[PDB]
Design a protein around this ligand. Structure first.
Ligand code: NCN
Length: 331
């Protein structure tokens, strides 16, 4: 099964072949979800094993099978559970292109029911589906995903609240102007406020991050400033260790994507001090991660360097130290 930090690709190959053989059973045996759930858990190599196994899932035709039998009741949750853990970038594209409606609807009905594992699965699927495009975000809003996450914002489960915060951040980033207007109409800040004041640092971080991304839009700045949650940014960045907060979150995974960070870049140039503080904090985190993985040139491909320098120059010392440390971790 799963052991430790070694140089073994034989396990990648073994469990990929197991997965493809089980998937070939087309005309229950959803231990594929257990194997992938524990594959992502591998201490350091979990990213590689997970990506290779999800690619094996798509290539063996299993992704199409999941999207097909997710409108069948007896195989609904059993399949959606596995789909929440294999919504990689390529799989995300495949789903968005050849069956968004079914996946969105199964996530909605997973959140509608009282069983907590189902709600976790549904909120996670929605989170991952909000990381594609303005068009995809608009469509998911139309199909009722935003309503589901804003309803789950009232929950107690921690996994669900984390999925909800990450989903609202992803939507603030990938939505655009129209979708951010829609978010303000749905009173997104109202239900983000209960999350920003959470004790769990992940929920607070990503809720505040969605709020910061939202104040950057100069049309909704006031309504997002009525929340109150940006006044919780300065104590957080000044009391949290950028390297250690990375190790707890988004370090097992190789940080956020270059496109996620590209959406975040324009936050570095906002009117609000707290927005720039939090964006700088996040970039100082991602810079160290990317340096560990040798993908630092990303920050130049997204024209983040100009904004990082402009921020490292500005008077505000909270963001100046973070942006400067980020620039040194790149070159
Ligand atoms: O990136 C990782 O190391 C990782 C760790 C645990 C789970 N995953 C799953 O891999 C998929 C892609 O993750 P992400 O962050 O690119 O949206 C998604 O289904 C995640 O739930 C990914």
């Amino acid at each position: 099964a799963g052991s430790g930090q070694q140089e073994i690709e034989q396990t990648i190959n073994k469990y990929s072949n197991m997965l493809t053989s089980i998937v070939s059973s087309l005309q229950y045996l959803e231990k594929i979800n257990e194997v992938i759930r524990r594959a992502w858990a591998v201490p350091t190599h979990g990213h590689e094993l997970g990506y290779s196994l999800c690619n094996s899932l798509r290539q063996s035709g299993g992704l199409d099978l999941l999207m097909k039998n997710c409108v069948k009741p007896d195989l609904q949750f059993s399949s959606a559970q596995l789909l929440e853990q294999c919504l990689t970038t390529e799989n995300r594209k495949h789903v968005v292109d050849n069956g968004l409606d079914k996946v969105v609807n199964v996530a909605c009905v997973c959140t509608k029911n009282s069983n907590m594992e189902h709600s976790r699965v549904g909120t996670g699927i929605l989170e991952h589906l909000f990381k594609h495009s303005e068009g995809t975000c608009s469509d998911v809003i139309r199909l009722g995903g935003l309503d589901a996450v804003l309803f789950e914002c009232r929950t107690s489960d921690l996994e669900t609240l984390r999925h909800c915060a990450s989903a609202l951040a992803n939507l603030s980033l990938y939505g655009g102007a129209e979708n951010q207007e829609e978010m303000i109409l749905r009173k997104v800040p109202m239900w983000l406020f209960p999350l920003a004041f959470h004790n769990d640092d992940n929920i607070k971080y990503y809720a505040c991050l969605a709020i910061a991304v939202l104040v950057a839009n100069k049309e909704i700045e006031a309504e997002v400033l009525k929340s109150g949650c940006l006044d919780l940014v300065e104590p957080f960045v000044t009391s949290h260790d950028p390297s250690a907060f990375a190790r707890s979150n988004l370090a097992h995974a190789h940080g956020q994507s270059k496109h996620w960070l590209k959406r975040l870049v324009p936050v570095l140039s906002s009117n609000r001090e707290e927005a720039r503080n939090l964006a700088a904090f996040h970039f100082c985190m991602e810079a160290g991660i990317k340096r560990e993985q040798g993908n630092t040139d990303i920050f130049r491909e997204i024209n983040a360097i100009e904004a990082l320098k402009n921020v490292a120059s500005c008077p505000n010392a909270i963001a100046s130290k973070f942006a400067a440390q980020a620039l040194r971790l790149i070159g």
